[PDB]
Design a protein around this nucleic acid. Structure first.
Length: 288
DNA sequence: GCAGTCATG
DNA sequence: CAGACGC
Protein backbone atom coordinates (compact mmCIF):
# COMPACT_ATOMS: atom_id res chain seq x y z
CA UNK A 1 0.00 0.00 0.00
CA UNK A 2 3.00 2.32 -0.44
CA UNK A 3 2.83 4.67 -3.42
CA UNK A 4 3.65 2.71 -6.57
CA UNK A 5 4.59 5.89 -8.40
CA UNK A 6 5.30 9.61 -8.16
CA UNK A 7 2.53 10.85 -10.48
CA UNK A 8 -0.98 11.38 -9.13
CA UNK A 9 -4.11 12.38 -11.04
CA UNK A 10 -7.62 13.42 -10.10
CA UNK A 11 -10.86 12.29 -11.68
CA UNK A 12 -14.09 14.01 -10.78
CA UNK A 13 -17.44 12.22 -10.45
CA UNK A 14 -21.08 13.25 -10.01
CA UNK A 15 -22.74 12.31 -6.67
CA UNK A 16 -24.34 10.12 -5.45
CA UNK A 17 -21.86 7.25 -5.74
CA UNK A 18 -21.85 4.07 -3.61
CA UNK A 19 -18.14 3.31 -3.52
CA UNK A 20 -18.57 0.75 -0.76
CA UNK A 21 -20.71 -1.31 -3.11
CA UNK A 22 -18.57 -0.70 -6.19
CA UNK A 23 -15.47 -1.91 -4.38
CA UNK A 24 -17.32 -4.79 -2.79
CA UNK A 25 -18.32 -5.96 -6.26
CA UNK A 26 -14.81 -5.69 -7.61
CA UNK A 27 -13.27 -7.41 -4.59
CA UNK A 28 -15.45 -10.50 -5.07
CA UNK A 29 -14.08 -10.87 -8.60
CA UNK A 30 -10.52 -9.75 -7.92
CA UNK A 31 -8.21 -12.07 -9.84
CA UNK A 32 -5.50 -12.99 -7.33
CA UNK A 33 -2.11 -11.46 -8.27
CA UNK A 34 -3.71 -9.23 -10.93
CA UNK A 35 -5.80 -6.94 -8.71
CA UNK A 36 -5.74 -6.03 -5.02
CA UNK A 37 -8.95 -4.67 -3.49
CA UNK A 38 -9.30 -3.28 0.04
CA UNK A 39 -11.62 -0.97 2.00
CA UNK A 40 -11.30 2.15 -0.14
CA UNK A 41 -8.46 1.07 -2.38
CA UNK A 42 -8.10 -0.68 -5.73
CA UNK A 43 -4.88 -1.64 -7.48
CA UNK A 44 -4.04 -3.67 -10.57
CA UNK A 45 -1.52 -4.35 -13.30
CA UNK A 46 -2.24 -2.51 -16.53
CA UNK A 47 -0.97 -2.69 -20.10
CA UNK A 48 -1.82 0.05 -22.56
CA UNK A 49 -0.44 -1.05 -25.88
CA UNK A 50 3.26 -1.66 -25.32
CA UNK A 51 3.48 0.18 -21.96
CA UNK A 52 3.26 -1.57 -18.61
CA UNK A 53 2.63 -0.58 -15.00
CA UNK A 54 0.28 -0.34 -12.01
CA UNK A 55 -2.77 1.79 -11.15
CA UNK A 56 -4.11 2.48 -7.75
CA UNK A 57 -7.42 4.25 -7.36
CA UNK A 58 -8.50 5.73 -4.04
CA UNK A 59 -11.95 7.38 -3.66
CA UNK A 60 -12.36 10.71 -1.89
CA UNK A 61 -16.04 10.97 -1.00
CA UNK A 62 -16.10 14.50 0.39
CA UNK A 63 -14.41 16.14 -2.61
CA UNK A 64 -16.21 13.62 -4.81
CA UNK A 65 -13.08 12.75 -6.79
CA UNK A 66 -11.06 9.59 -7.40
CA UNK A 67 -7.32 9.58 -6.77
CA UNK A 68 -5.15 7.75 -9.28
CA UNK A 69 -1.51 6.79 -8.91
CA UNK A 70 0.45 5.50 -11.90
CA UNK A 71 3.64 3.45 -12.02
CA UNK A 72 6.34 5.19 -14.08
CA UNK A 73 6.00 2.83 -17.07
CA UNK A 74 2.40 4.06 -17.47
CA UNK A 75 3.12 7.80 -17.40
CA UNK A 76 3.43 8.20 -21.21
CA UNK A 77 -0.10 6.85 -21.63
CA UNK A 78 -1.73 8.34 -18.55
CA UNK A 79 -4.54 9.95 -20.53
CA UNK A 80 -5.54 6.50 -21.80
CA UNK A 81 -5.03 4.85 -18.41
CA UNK A 82 -7.47 7.36 -16.87
CA UNK A 83 -9.99 6.52 -19.58
CA UNK A 84 -9.80 2.89 -18.52
CA UNK A 85 -10.33 3.89 -14.89
CA UNK A 86 -13.32 5.98 -16.00
CA UNK A 87 -14.86 3.03 -17.83
CA UNK A 88 -13.87 0.66 -15.05
CA UNK A 89 -15.69 2.89 -12.58
CA UNK A 90 -18.49 4.52 -14.61
CA UNK A 91 -17.32 8.03 -13.67
CA UNK A 92 -19.01 9.92 -16.51
CA UNK A 93 -22.43 8.66 -15.47
CA UNK A 94 -25.11 11.29 -14.82
CA UNK A 95 -26.98 9.62 -11.89
CA UNK A 96 -29.84 12.15 -11.79
CA UNK A 97 -30.73 11.34 -15.39
CA UNK A 98 -30.40 7.60 -14.77
CA UNK A 99 -32.26 7.45 -11.47
CA UNK A 100 -34.86 9.85 -12.79
CA UNK A 101 -35.54 7.41 -15.62
CA UNK A 102 -35.49 4.41 -13.26
CA UNK A 103 -38.10 6.04 -11.02
CA UNK A 104 -38.91 3.79 -8.05
CA UNK A 105 -36.37 1.19 -9.09
CA UNK A 106 -33.52 3.66 -8.51
CA UNK A 107 -34.72 5.08 -5.16
CA UNK A 108 -33.25 2.51 -2.76
CA UNK A 109 -29.62 2.80 -3.81
CA UNK A 110 -29.08 5.68 -6.32
CA UNK A 111 -25.29 5.33 -6.01
CA UNK A 112 -25.27 2.09 -8.02
CA UNK A 113 -22.95 2.36 -11.02
CA UNK A 114 -22.13 -0.01 -13.88
CA UNK A 115 -18.97 -1.90 -12.94
CA UNK A 116 -16.99 -1.84 -16.18
CA UNK A 117 -13.50 -2.99 -17.12
CA UNK A 118 -10.09 -2.00 -18.43
CA UNK A 119 -9.73 -4.26 -21.44
CA UNK A 120 -12.57 -5.54 -23.60
CA UNK A 121 -10.79 -8.83 -24.24
CA UNK A 122 -10.03 -9.36 -20.56
CA UNK A 123 -13.70 -8.98 -19.74
CA UNK A 124 -14.23 -11.55 -22.50
CA UNK A 125 -12.14 -14.24 -20.83
CA UNK A 126 -14.00 -13.43 -17.60
CA UNK A 127 -17.51 -13.59 -19.08
CA UNK A 128 -16.66 -17.09 -20.32
CA UNK A 129 -14.74 -18.35 -17.32
CA UNK A 130 -17.58 -17.02 -15.16
CA UNK A 131 -20.09 -19.34 -16.82
CA UNK A 132 -21.99 -21.88 -14.71
CA UNK A 133 -19.92 -21.12 -11.58
CA UNK A 134 -19.97 -19.00 -8.41
CA UNK A 135 -18.37 -15.54 -8.59
CA UNK A 136 -15.73 -16.95 -6.24
CA UNK A 137 -14.95 -20.05 -8.30
CA UNK A 138 -14.49 -18.01 -11.49
CA UNK A 139 -11.99 -15.89 -9.55
CA UNK A 140 -9.84 -18.85 -8.48
CA UNK A 141 -10.09 -20.27 -11.99
CA UNK A 142 -9.04 -16.96 -13.57
CA UNK A 143 -6.19 -16.87 -11.07
CA UNK A 144 -4.79 -20.19 -12.29
CA UNK A 145 -5.02 -19.10 -15.95
CA UNK A 146 -3.35 -15.75 -15.34
CA UNK A 147 -0.58 -17.29 -13.29
CA UNK A 148 0.08 -19.63 -16.22
CA UNK A 149 -0.27 -17.26 -19.20
CA UNK A 150 0.06 -13.92 -17.43
CA UNK A 151 3.13 -11.76 -18.04
CA UNK A 152 4.98 -10.56 -14.91
CA UNK A 153 5.93 -6.92 -14.28
CA UNK A 154 9.61 -6.01 -14.55
CA UNK A 155 9.34 -3.53 -11.70
CA UNK A 156 6.45 -4.94 -9.66
CA UNK A 157 7.26 -8.69 -9.32
CA UNK A 158 4.32 -9.11 -6.99
CA UNK A 159 2.06 -8.21 -9.95
CA UNK A 160 1.17 -10.02 -13.14
CA UNK A 161 -0.59 -8.80 -16.30
CA UNK A 162 -3.78 -10.45 -17.47
CA UNK A 163 -2.83 -12.87 -20.30
CA UNK A 164 -2.67 -11.24 -23.75
CA UNK A 165 -4.62 -12.32 -26.85
CA UNK A 166 -1.25 -13.46 -28.17
CA UNK A 167 -0.19 -15.87 -25.42
CA UNK A 168 -3.76 -17.14 -25.01
CA UNK A 169 -4.70 -17.94 -28.60
CA UNK A 170 -1.50 -19.98 -28.53
CA UNK A 171 -2.64 -21.86 -25.42
CA UNK A 172 -2.97 -25.64 -25.52
CA UNK A 173 -6.66 -26.57 -25.07
CA UNK A 174 -5.44 -29.40 -22.83
CA UNK A 175 -3.41 -27.28 -20.40
CA UNK A 176 -6.46 -25.06 -20.03
CA UNK A 177 -8.89 -27.89 -19.22
CA UNK A 178 -6.53 -29.08 -16.48
CA UNK A 179 -6.77 -25.77 -14.61
CA UNK A 180 -10.36 -26.84 -14.09
CA UNK A 181 -12.77 -26.31 -16.97
CA UNK A 182 -14.63 -28.31 -19.66
CA UNK A 183 -12.72 -28.65 -22.93
CA UNK A 184 -15.42 -26.84 -24.91
CA UNK A 185 -14.77 -23.78 -22.74
CA UNK A 186 -11.01 -23.96 -23.24
CA UNK A 187 -11.81 -23.60 -26.95
CA UNK A 188 -14.17 -20.62 -26.49
CA UNK A 189 -11.34 -18.85 -24.70
CA UNK A 190 -9.03 -19.68 -27.59
CA UNK A 191 -11.59 -18.64 -30.17
CA UNK A 192 -12.13 -15.35 -28.40
CA UNK A 193 -8.38 -14.94 -28.04
CA UNK A 194 -8.15 -15.36 -31.83
CA UNK A 195 -11.01 -13.00 -32.66
CA UNK A 196 -9.31 -10.20 -30.75
CA UNK A 197 -6.08 -10.97 -32.58
CA UNK A 198 -7.51 -10.45 -36.06
CA UNK A 199 -10.04 -7.75 -35.15
CA UNK A 200 -13.33 -9.65 -35.21
CA UNK A 201 -14.00 -8.78 -31.56
CA UNK A 202 -14.79 -5.05 -31.09
CA UNK A 203 -12.52 -3.55 -28.42
CA UNK A 204 -14.70 -0.48 -27.91
CA UNK A 205 -18.45 0.01 -27.86
CA UNK A 206 -19.87 -0.60 -31.39
CA UNK A 207 -22.42 1.77 -32.97
CA UNK A 208 -25.10 -0.88 -33.35
CA UNK A 209 -24.72 -2.72 -30.04
CA UNK A 210 -27.78 -4.91 -30.56
CA UNK A 211 -26.25 -6.08 -33.87
CA UNK A 212 -22.80 -6.78 -32.47
CA UNK A 213 -24.24 -9.04 -29.73
CA UNK A 214 -25.90 -11.00 -32.50
CA UNK A 215 -22.49 -11.57 -34.08
CA UNK A 216 -21.02 -12.56 -30.70
CA UNK A 217 -23.40 -15.42 -29.95
CA UNK A 218 -22.12 -17.23 -33.05
CA UNK A 219 -18.86 -17.68 -31.16
CA UNK A 220 -18.67 -21.15 -29.55
CA UNK A 221 -19.44 -21.13 -25.83
CA UNK A 222 -21.08 -17.72 -26.06
CA UNK A 223 -24.86 -17.75 -25.71
CA UNK A 224 -27.41 -14.95 -25.44
CA UNK A 225 -26.65 -14.43 -21.76
CA UNK A 226 -22.85 -14.42 -21.90
CA UNK A 227 -23.00 -12.06 -24.87
CA UNK A 228 -25.26 -9.74 -22.85
CA UNK A 229 -23.24 -9.69 -19.64
CA UNK A 230 -20.23 -9.04 -21.85
CA UNK A 231 -21.77 -6.03 -23.60
CA UNK A 232 -22.62 -4.67 -20.14
CA UNK A 233 -19.32 -5.12 -18.30
CA UNK A 234 -17.33 -5.24 -21.53
CA UNK A 235 -18.56 -2.37 -23.68
CA UNK A 236 -20.30 -0.65 -20.78
CA UNK A 237 -23.41 -0.56 -22.89
CA UNK A 238 -26.05 1.10 -20.77
CA UNK A 239 -29.15 -0.14 -22.60
CA UNK A 240 -28.93 -3.93 -22.13
CA UNK A 241 -31.24 -6.41 -20.40
CA UNK A 242 -31.27 -10.09 -19.34
CA UNK A 243 -34.92 -11.24 -19.41
CA UNK A 244 -33.65 -14.84 -19.46
CA UNK A 245 -31.40 -14.40 -16.42
CA UNK A 246 -32.78 -16.62 -13.66
CA UNK A 247 -32.53 -14.33 -10.66
CA UNK A 248 -34.51 -11.78 -12.68
CA UNK A 249 -37.40 -13.99 -13.74
CA UNK A 250 -37.51 -15.09 -10.11
CA UNK A 251 -38.75 -11.54 -9.51
CA UNK A 252 -41.15 -11.64 -12.47
CA UNK A 253 -43.39 -14.52 -11.26
CA UNK A 254 -44.41 -16.57 -14.29
CA UNK A 255 -43.38 -14.47 -17.27
CA UNK A 256 -41.86 -15.17 -20.67
CA UNK A 257 -38.49 -13.73 -21.79
CA UNK A 258 -40.79 -11.57 -23.93
CA UNK A 259 -43.35 -10.61 -21.29
CA UNK A 260 -40.33 -9.14 -19.52
CA UNK A 261 -38.38 -7.89 -22.56
CA UNK A 262 -41.32 -5.54 -23.14
CA UNK A 263 -41.83 -4.55 -19.50
CA UNK A 264 -38.23 -3.29 -19.53
CA UNK A 265 -38.89 -0.92 -22.44
CA UNK A 266 -40.24 1.44 -19.80
CA UNK A 267 -36.59 1.82 -18.78
CA UNK A 268 -35.03 2.53 -22.15
CA UNK A 269 -32.29 3.82 -22.68
CA UNK A 270 -30.91 2.79 -19.27
CA UNK A 271 -31.87 -0.86 -19.15
CA UNK A 272 -28.45 -1.91 -17.87
CA UNK A 273 -28.87 0.25 -14.76
CA UNK A 274 -32.37 -1.21 -14.36
CA UNK A 275 -30.89 -4.70 -14.50
CA UNK A 276 -28.16 -3.99 -11.93
CA UNK A 277 -30.69 -2.46 -9.57
CA UNK A 278 -33.24 -5.28 -9.54
CA UNK A 279 -30.34 -7.62 -8.78
CA UNK A 280 -28.72 -5.83 -5.85
CA UNK A 281 -31.96 -4.36 -4.56
CA UNK A 282 -33.67 -7.37 -3.01
CA UNK A 283 -36.62 -5.59 -1.41
CA UNK A 284 -37.81 -4.43 -4.82
CA UNK A 285 -40.93 -5.88 -6.42
CA UNK A 286 -42.42 -5.11 -9.90
CA UNK A 287 -45.63 -3.22 -10.73
CA UNK A 288 -48.53 -5.57 -11.47
C1' DG B 1 -32.02 -35.44 -9.54
C1' DC B 2 -32.54 -30.06 -10.46
C1' DA B 3 -31.29 -25.96 -12.85
C1' DG B 4 -28.56 -22.76 -15.45
C1' DT B 5 -27.09 -21.79 -20.15
C1' DC B 6 -25.36 -22.98 -24.90
C1' DA B 7 -27.32 -25.24 -29.11
C1' DT B 8 -30.84 -26.47 -33.54
C1' DG B 9 -35.86 -27.19 -35.73
C1' DC C 1 -40.78 -19.51 -29.09
C1' DA C 2 -40.04 -25.14 -28.15
C1' DG C 3 -32.14 -31.57 -26.32
C1' DA C 4 -27.02 -31.52 -24.84
C1' DC C 5 -23.49 -29.57 -21.68
C1' DG C 6 -21.57 -28.36 -11.37
C1' DC C 7 -24.67 -28.10 -6.44
Amino acid sequence: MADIGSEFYTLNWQPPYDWSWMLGFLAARAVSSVETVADSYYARSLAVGEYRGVVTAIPDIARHTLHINLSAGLEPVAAECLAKMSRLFDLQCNPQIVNGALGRLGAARPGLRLPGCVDAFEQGVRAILGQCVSVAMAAKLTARVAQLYGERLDDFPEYICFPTPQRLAAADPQALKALGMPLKRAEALIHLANAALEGTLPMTIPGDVEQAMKTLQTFPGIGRWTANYFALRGWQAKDVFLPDDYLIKQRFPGMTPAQIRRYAERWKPWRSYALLHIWYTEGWQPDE
